[PDB]
Design an enzyme around this catalytic site. Structure first.
Site, short mmCIF file in Angstrom:
data_model
loop_
_atom_site.label_atom_id
_atom_site.label_comp_id
_atom_site.label_asym_id
_atom_site.label_seq_id
_atom_site.Cartn_x
_atom_site.Cartn_y
_atom_site.Cartn_z
N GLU A 1 13.55 -31.50 8.45
CA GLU A 1 12.60 -30.40 8.28
C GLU A 1 12.92 -29.38 7.15
O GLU A 1 12.00 -29.20 6.32
CB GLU A 1 12.22 -29.57 9.65
CG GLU A 1 11.74 -28.65 9.40
CD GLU A 1 10.07 -28.74 9.58
OE1 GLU A 1 9.65 -29.76 9.53
OE2 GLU A 1 9.38 -27.65 8.83
N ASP B 1 18.70 -24.19 -2.03
CA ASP B 1 17.72 -24.39 -3.06
C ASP B 1 17.70 -23.08 -4.15
O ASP B 1 18.15 -22.03 -3.91
CB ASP B 1 16.25 -24.95 -2.36
CG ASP B 1 15.57 -23.87 -1.89
OD1 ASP B 1 15.41 -22.73 -2.45
OD2 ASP B 1 15.33 -23.94 -0.67
N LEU C 1 7.37 -33.61 16.17
CA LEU C 1 6.30 -33.33 15.15
C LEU C 1 6.69 -33.38 13.79
O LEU C 1 7.92 -32.93 13.32
CB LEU C 1 5.90 -31.85 15.48
CG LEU C 1 4.81 -31.60 16.53
CD1 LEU C 1 4.84 -30.18 17.43
CD2 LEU C 1 3.28 -31.88 15.72
N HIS C 2 5.75 -33.60 13.19
CA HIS C 2 5.88 -33.61 11.41
C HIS C 2 5.79 -32.01 11.03
O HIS C 2 4.80 -31.32 11.62
CB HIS C 2 5.34 -34.51 10.67
CG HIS C 2 5.22 -34.48 9.32
ND1 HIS C 2 6.58 -34.81 8.71
CD2 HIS C 2 4.72 -34.14 8.19
CE1 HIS C 2 6.45 -34.61 7.35
NE2 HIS C 2 5.39 -34.31 7.10
N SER D 1 11.50 -22.73 12.22
CA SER D 1 11.61 -22.06 13.69
C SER D 1 12.02 -22.76 14.58
O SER D 1 12.91 -22.33 15.50
CB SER D 1 10.27 -20.98 14.12
OG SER D 1 9.29 -21.89 13.73
#
Ligand SMILES: CO[C@@H]1[C@@H](OC(N)=O)[C@@H](O)[C@H](Oc2ccc3c(O)c(NC(=O)c4ccc(O)c(CC=C(C)C)c4)c(=O)oc3c2C)OC1(C)C
EC number: 5.6.2.2
Length: 194
Positions: free
Chosen positions: A31, A62, A92-93, A98
């Site tokens: 994620e 990043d 879930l995708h 969070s």
């Protein structure tokens, strides 16, 4: 809310995927990377660095814009609210960071932009103190490093290089132009997918 998190901690598998076979555990890594890869598709990030720490913690750095810091900060909001500002065996995708925060015994957030360095520490989704500037910089970017909660993840508890390298490899290929590096502090193994 605080409850929002309670719900996640209550039924983690529903959001993250299976918590016993290694699935959910590694998806916690995916994620966060997906968030960085989105900043790259946006045109602001060129390189992503994924590191496995020998304390069994994973970091993703990043060089994108850095999550907006100003005012609770918007960054705090992204880290603590379910589908912040929007709507939604693998869970879930795009579950949002969070959810990774909530399922982490500890999460450290480091943001650079506008000549400053900002950091904040959370524990099981809860901020232990406000986000603050800690120094000066000339660079830009987001660094997230987290330690998965052991009350949530059972059986397969340690990150495995092979699982991540197969997926990061797929991600670079499917997102031509994005440079992703992987490093294993446990043994000095590194990879560069381009
Ligand atoms: C995990 O946070 C992610 C970011 O992840 C990474 N790794 O950068 C990225 O995937 C994407 O990052 C965005 C997405 C939208 C904006 C964006 O619209 C910006 N521009 C603004 O003018 C702006 C300035 C102040 C402010 O409070 C907001 C709203 C805050 C947001 C959308 C988090 C936006 C900006 O500076 O950075 C942005 C950034 C960094 O969406 C997030 C925040 C959920």
């Amino acid at each position: 809310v605080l409850k929002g998190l309670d719900a996640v901690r209550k039924r983690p598998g529903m959001y993250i995927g299976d918590t016993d076979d290694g699935t959910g555990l590694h998806h916690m890594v995916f994620e966060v990377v997906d968030n960085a890869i989105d900043e790259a598709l946006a045109g602001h990030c060129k390189e992503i660095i994924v590191t496995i720490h020998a304390d069994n913690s994973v970091s993703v750095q990043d060089d994108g814009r850095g999550i907006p810091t100003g005012i609770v900060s918007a960054a705090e909001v992204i880290m603590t609210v379910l589908h912040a500002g929007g709507k939604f065996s693998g869970g879930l995708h795009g579950v949002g960071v969070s959810v990774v925060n909530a399922l982490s015994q500890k999460l450290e957030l480091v943001i650079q932009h506008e000549g400053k360095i900002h950091r904040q520490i959370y524990e099981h989704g809860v901020p232990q103190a406000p986000l603050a500037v800690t120094g000066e910089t000339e660079k830009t970017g987001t660094m997230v490093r987290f330690w998965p909660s052991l009350e949530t993840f059972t059986n397969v508890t340690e990150f495995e290089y092979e699982i991540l390298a197969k997926r990061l490899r797929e991600l670079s290929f499917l997102n031509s132009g994005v440079s992703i590096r992987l490093r294993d502090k446990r043994d000095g193994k590194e990879d560069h997918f381009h």
